Fold PROTEIN (Blood Coagulation Factor VII).
Amino acid sequence: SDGDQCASSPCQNGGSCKDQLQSYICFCLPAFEGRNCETHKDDGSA
C-alpha cells in the first residue's frame, strides 16, 4: 500500500473502491464523472 487512498471508501455514487498502488480506482456507472464519482454526466451529445 502507498498512502490512505481507499481507506474510508472515497468512491461515491455507490461505486466500488479498489487500491491500485499509490492512487485508487472507483467503479461507478458510465453515467457518473469525477475522480471520486461526484458528477452525473447524462448528456451524450457526441
